[PDB]
Design a protein around this nucleic acid. Structure first.
Ligand SMILES: Nc1ncnc2c1ncn2[C@H]1C[C@H](O)[C@@H](COP(=O)(O)OP(=O)(O)OP(=O)(O)O)O1
Ligand SMILES: [Mg+2]
Ligand SMILES: [Mg+2]
Ligand SMILES: [Mg+2]
Length: 378
DNA sequence: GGGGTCCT
DNA sequence: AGGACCC
């Protein structure tokens, strides 16, 4: 059962949202700042030299006409994120989320229908929407191709409906699994879509340069492979299965090797509603017992907001700390579920804290987070 | 340095 | 509770 998956990726998301909010900013170049960095910006300002993830001063010097904006309150982005996800669900119910600006959709069933509904005669021109990866020749006689071309049209449709109705632009990659879909989706940016035919699969993995470029292989797994002298995607393709299992575990080994061939059988998971809420906060110095108290209050303060609105309730709370991450958690008592409600929580959160960190001694940390998970019904 | 997700 | 991964 060959699948058709689509990966959707919004162009410079925060930027887009900001612009869609303050139209005056269409004309102007724009950057979104978190702490003293620039986390993303519209294209009008990537041309003036502004690289994503660059300090806000180099930014200003390199580009003086730059209109900055604060993107530390993730609230407008997160609402837009779900407006997008809901739009896409209205196409097919099975939509997986990846951060705020990515979505996976399984179009296998949807492509099925549209095909059957095709009178033989009209089996052309059929056509393709957007780019075909690596300019590959289409073979209308190959069902696999045909189902991917239909996947391209549904994607073009989704992208139209995102623009109309939400005012957002973005790219789409349509492939036979999530891996290839995500990889081929950025081959043409911004605001364009590419489809990957099967016979160009190998061209696409090898186009990659560092092995960490593949989704799934990350910082910790890369370094492991590096120290094994695995740097190219072909290195990994050709390496000893056995030695890899031995050095990575039989679970991780099998999967990432398949990855390096472009093989990915992981299904698209239906995300549904968020299963957690959390406010992170890292900082220069924190070294008493209070000031964690102040922090935990603020964090709690902001989180509470979102919980009041979500609907369902958290039956578990936890405390996270990256020291000099660790966590402790415990169920949230029956009474307190009455969305005042602060002091009891912070008493628990502190109880948590205390058992984890010795207050009768110095610590200093850099990171405090509070998380609400385990929400019913579930 | 956000927020999140699944696997162990 | 910790360790991976994605953004
Ligand atoms: N290093 C980072 N630090 C903080 N926020 C980030 C970082 N990277 C990305 N983000 C945020 C900002 C973006 O709106 C969103 C997705 O980023 P990313 O996938 O890198 O592409 P992008 O949305 O910045 O634009 P584009 O895909 O056009 O380059 O996540
Ligand atoms: Mg992205
Ligand atoms: Mg993006
Ligand atoms: Mg990676």
């Amino acid at each position: 059962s060959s699948r058709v998956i689509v990966h959707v990726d919004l162009d410079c998301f925060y930027a887009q949202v900001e612009m869609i909010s303050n139209p005056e900013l269409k004309d102007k170049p724009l950057g979104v700042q978190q702490k003293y960095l620039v986390v993303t910006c519209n294209y009008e300002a990537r041309k003036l030299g502004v690289k994503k993830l660059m300090n806000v001063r180099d930014a200003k010097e390199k580009c003086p006409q730059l209109v900055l904006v604060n993107g530390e309150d993730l609230t407008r982005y997160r609402e837009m994120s779900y407006k997008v996800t809901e739009l896409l669900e209205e196409f097919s119910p099975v939509v997986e989320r990846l951060g705020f600006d990515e979505n996976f959709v399984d179009l296998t069933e949807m492509v099925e229908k549209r095909l059957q509904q095709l009178q033989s005669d009209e089996l052309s021109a059929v056509t393709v929407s957007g780019h075909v990866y690596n300019n590959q020749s289409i073979n209308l006689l190959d069902v696999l191709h045909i189902r991917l071309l239909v996947g391209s049209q549904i994607a073009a449709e989704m992208r139209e409906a995102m623009y109309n109705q939400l005012g957002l632009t973005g790219c789409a990659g349509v492939a036979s699994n999530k891996l290839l879909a995500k990889l081929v989706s950025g081959v043409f940016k911004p605001n364009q879509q590419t489809v990957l035919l099967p016979e160009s699969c190998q061209h696409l993995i090898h186009s990659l340069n560092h092995i960490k470029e593949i989704p799934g292989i990350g910082y910790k797994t890369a370094k492991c492979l590096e120290a094994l002298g695995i740097n190219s995607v072909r290195d990994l393709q050709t390496f000893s299965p056995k030695i890899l299992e031995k050095e990575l575990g039989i679970s991780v080994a099998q999967r990432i090797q398949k990855l390096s061939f472009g093989e990915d059988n992981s299904p698209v998971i239906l995300s549904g509603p968020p299963q957690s809420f959390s406010e992170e906060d890292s900082f220069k110095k924190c070294s008493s017992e209070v000031e964690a108290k102040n922090k935990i209050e603020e964090l709690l303060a902001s989180l509470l907001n979102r919980v009041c609105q979500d609907g369902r309730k958290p039956h578990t709370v936890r405390l996270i700390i990256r020291r000099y991450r660790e966590s402790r958690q415990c169920p949230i008592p029956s009474h307190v579920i009455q969305k005042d409600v602060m002091t009891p929580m912070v008493d628990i959160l502190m109880k948590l804290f205390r058992n984890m960190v010795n207050v009768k001694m110095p610590f200093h940390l850099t990171l405090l987070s509070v998380c609400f998970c385990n929400l019913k019904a579930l």
